[PDB]
Write a protein that binds this ligand. Structure first.
Ligand SMILES: NC(=[NH2+])NCCC[C@H]1O[C@@H](n2cnc3c(N)ncnc32)[C@H](O)[C@@H]1O
Ligand SMILES: NC(=[NH2+])NCCC[C@H]1O[C@@H](n2cnc3c(N)ncnc32)[C@H](O)[C@@H]1O
Ligand SMILES: NC(=[NH2+])NCCC[C@H]1O[C@@H](n2cnc3c(N)ncnc32)[C@H](O)[C@@H]1O
Ligand SMILES: NC(=[NH2+])NCCC[C@H]1O[C@@H](n2cnc3c(N)ncnc32)[C@H](O)[C@@H]1O
Lengths: 343, 342, 344, 344
């Protein structure tokens, strides 16, 4: 299938074991920003659900399907590939909705749905939006969508901004300098210091931060889920040109995302920006290998190229340069193995 | 091979990729109790290494092989299945020990060695001793051991004792009662409340605690690595009979372990007991879904049964009863995925 | 055929009036100096409402209120009491040389026969949460003896309710019920009754005080005008509410207190049991939800508190609360007759 | 119409069985480890008295004693319970897969009908001072279903009486009553009720525990053999005493506790509430003399404790004692139904 062709088996096994846990479903469900905003977007756009056919992609415990039912949906198809499908079907029974919600265990790329739907709902966003590559399953599901159908979320925006954080940059070398000693219990470890440095810099840093470290208005890359094909997410080239608002050393790029539910009554926004209350997505920061000095008014231009891999994640190639000086830096990171720094 | 037969490929991929990271090596090495104790065991028993042939199973970055070299070993075969083996070779060259330390990439169950060895060294202990099933690889390597060869460590003791800790119990209880809500955003979740309790209490709790929470002296279960066969670790039955020293609620069993290096000069112990300085092993507690009440003088009887699984871990079954009252508790735990609370 | 006996089970009335026959209970009430001092102040500072007047004292007990009315110059005070405390009242009236002014009349106010209509009724009819003991209905029944120009002391009653957060109290009651969760109590599986245990424990309103910082929104107020209300009004009391949440957190239930006003000709005197006021023997009352409701600052928590009077001289309380933004709903039933006294 | 109804006022019975309809009261009794542990040990360690036998459990409550009988291998257990707790007991019989061996029979043991005679009766009927609640009479009444060989668990009951000295406890009665001895409480002279307040406090048996060093003489014992006694024997209980004073001092009253023995074929097991044993939910009971009695070590304190059963499921207590060497005499009349719980 499409899913298996693009996914290494070992990665998929571990992936669906993770989401088979009720504690991980709970982790997502008790994030009020995530769960409250979905519910508010569905109910406030009730005319998009009333007496409609709905598809829920990766329903998990089924919480989003229940919101669709609260909005008057005629029939809801909830697809779930992990063993959580058993629990979702339990809740469908206990909430007396067996005539409205039909749980379908299996992968949305492999299961067989009977009819076309009026709207697809799903919560597939991961770290910097694209991690886990579930947006491709979300877009793949549009084979079941009527031509005049809708998508919730309708659009996703990933935001990129430069940041200064001397502490974070220096932290990488303080850790790596563990290896820079000539007699650790009699052993000279210093030959691995370089490898240890490179290891740390390949890890995106997941945590939050104060917005005062941002040095320029963010640049935005939009994916319209109603127009996009899943092939558009195999290679995502995000050019950026930052108009520096502050002078200082730029240590890397910070990432966050927004999604929007463009309904017939209104549009509702779910944001994970650092100017908003913290969510379980946090934010993501990728360091440059060497910082770049930029004056307020200078332009920092470059590209962020996200290349999908068979581990359900991305390799992140960043290239940046200060146009007015030519000073240039770069980095190559592995989003599948981030460093969780939040405390 | 023996390894692949007992290991799901998905688990082994994740396992050896975890141990390919230099940051994890730094973490183990910075456990000063662990590193310092291993060095002392080896150097103070230098006669067991002087001009000997050594095998280091799962050498990682190679630190134990360097200790063997410092103690006078003639040749050290350092086996390592992860990509950390290439980093081990770098250090061997940078420390000018190419004539004494020979890294052998691959699994100890698959590689070939040119000769038998006088002593096997390794650090195979996971959480609760048995996690990761590395002890089976350690014992498997005895096929390379000369008759009357030595093992470092030589024996391992598992200790288990009943504990009381209302705070910990209610902490896990609270996490599961999320699925008790009859109107989470209008949705009745209460039908999954049983499943959630089961899931949350299958997690062993990895952290330290004060010794005063323990309600009886520990029971010891000993594995003699010189005699044990790897088959002995597929199903481990630990009977226990505790004589309660205090009255109160028993919220479960606490686990720790000691290993001894029984060398020709002196015996050196590495302990993870709560009476001893903290290590990266901490201690492990398996909670009961419902505690048992006991009084001082009562006997708490039962069995702890560890069934090894193909995910390089163990399924744990604990059955316990207060003999005087017939109050029984039966619990199942998945050691693979513990809850780190420290 | 008496109004009282028609709404009261015999077994409840017997225990009720035996309880109030004890002098130790009278001492406890009298030693609430907020209560006793505020009553005296409301009467004496409005002495013109009593001077040369005819007074009816409903449920006089040992008779303290009738003595306050005599100090304010009442011409005649009929002191009605249905317990055996009426005999101790008589002793005090003689020993205080007031036999010419205070006439004890033993019996239920719904069953006795007063010699004449009165200018003012005084009573202390407030129980826990105001309504417990259904004494307000005897107080209002007594208006059949009140002149058209007559007054009532107290004149009005305000019930206040507000949502609160108190994880320790919730877990305290939750733990008690968890005993019936044991699958092997001396080898016996009790878990099948765990549901019934939780229902029983959370049926108990909690009587004690608390810090005002646990309250999550401004109180809603329900007012009873004793001068205008009729007995039948108190059979079914419906209190809708809509709270604008001022803090975020888990709503564990609703807290209740009450105020009464003595609206006299000279001044209005208030007796309050609010948690912002000095503590009285009424304390405050909290009704716990079996499952707390999560709310955000700015959300609305709406619903109904409904009190259905029962024949055990108390009320069946049903509370339905709902977070409007999320539709998270909580329904609860409580038995006000048998609260949990948590203050000790 | 029934033995129970002819000796119990309806109002008292209504309140009595409502009390035992609460799971919290069952929990309180079940969590007394001395009570529950000792019954289980007495039943299991005499398993031959139960193995494949027919058993009657009088007032089973939640049914715990019946489950212990089943653990001991009983063939058939009839568990009789008059309160609504009988519905909960049935739930537990089902959930524990014992419906084939335990039959819950809702009703009063004096009014139900059993299908057959039984080999042994089990029950926990002891109240405060052993006799409070008068359920020993229901226990004895049940012997109409017992076989000639049948046994009783408990088999015998001993109530113990001993004189004590406790200045603090005695004085405390006047400290509390002297609230009324003031001439102007908010203008009112309360002093005329001080004597009535004193009398009220002394009528209450004091329920709490104490140091054994307050006892002034070895206890006297009154025994009820449950295999032999009849209901009527407990309507008037006369306990003579002649204490030989071990210490000199003022005797302020009599302390009461009790023991019971399960006399089985294998062994006898004792359940004791004596002040020398671990504390139980029965505590101990002390009845004051309204005037203490001075006695020297070696003197004799002689008198009688008369317990007269009443229709409120309790006893009126009449104690009279005198020091034979001096003639100084004292007495008291106490109401066992309304004890004063002093324990903290
Ligand atoms: N926002 C995220 N970071 N992750 C959203 C995961 C939500 C649910 O989608 C399920 N899921 C993921 N991929 C698929 C798929 N191809 N088909 C069906 N269910 C899936 C997964 O098992 C989980 O229960
Ligand atoms: N103290 C522990 N918690 N675990 C000790 C074993 C872990 C180390 O041994 C390596 N290792 C694990 N299994 C094997 C094996 N079968 N063969 C070779 N190396 C192995 C693994 O890659 C890592 O370097
Ligand atoms: N403040 C309270 N917490 N409860 C209300 C006052 C209680 C007093 O009124 C008496 N009382 C209660 N009901 C009645 C009645 N129907 N008629 C006369 N006295 C009564 C009762 O005997 C006691 O002396
Ligand atoms: N140890 C005590 N201090 N009291 C014993 C009461 C135990 C149980 O006996 C029940 N019970 C009491 N009297 C009776 C009776 N006549 N018939 C049946 N059950 C009864 C009562 O409802 C309660 O559940």
């Amino acid at each position: 299938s499409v899913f298996s062709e693009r996914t290494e088996e070992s990665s998929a096994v571990q992936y669906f074991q993770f989401y088979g846990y009720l504690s991980q479903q709970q982790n997502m469900m008790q994030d009020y920003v995530r769960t409250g905003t979905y519910q508010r977007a569905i109910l406030q756009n009730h005319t998009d659900f009333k007496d409609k056919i709905v598809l829920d992609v990766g329903c998990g415990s089924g919480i989003l399907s229940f919101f669709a039912a609260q909005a008057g949906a005629r029939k809801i198809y909830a697809v779930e590939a992990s063993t959580m499908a058993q629990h979702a079907e339990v809740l469908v029974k206990s909430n007396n909705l067996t005539d409205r919600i039909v749980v379908i265990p299996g992968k949305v790329e492999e299961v067989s749905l009977p009819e076309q739907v009026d709207i697809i709902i799903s919560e597939p966003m991961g770290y910097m939006l694209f991690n886990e590559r579930m947006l491709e399953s979300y877009l793949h599901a549009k084979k079941y969508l009527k031509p005049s159908g809708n998508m919730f979320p309708t659009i996703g925006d990933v935001h990129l901004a430069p940041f200064t954080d001397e502490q974070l940059y220096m932290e990488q070398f303080t850790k790596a300098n563990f290896w820079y000693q000539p007699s650790f219990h009699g052993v000279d470890l210093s030959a691995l210091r370089g490898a240890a440095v490179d290891e740390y810099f390949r890890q995106p840093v997941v945590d939050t931060f104060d917005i005062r470290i941002l040095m320029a208005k963010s640049v935005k890359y939009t994916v319209n889920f109603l127009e996009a094909k899943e092939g558009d997410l195999h290679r995502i080239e995000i050019p950026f040109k930052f108009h520096m608002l502050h002078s200082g050393l730029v240590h890397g790029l910070a990432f966050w995302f927004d999604v929007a539910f463009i309904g017939s009554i209104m549009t509702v926004w779910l944001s994970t920006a650092p100017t908003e209350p913290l969510t379980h997505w946090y934010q993501v920061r990728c360091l440059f290998q060497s910082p770049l000095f930029a004056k307020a008014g200078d332009t920092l231009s470059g590209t962020c190229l996200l290349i999908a891999n068979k581990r359900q994640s991305y390799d992140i190639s960043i290239v940046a340069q200060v146009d007015q000086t030519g000073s240039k830096s770069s980095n190559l990171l592995d989003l599948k193995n981030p460093f969780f720094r939040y405390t």
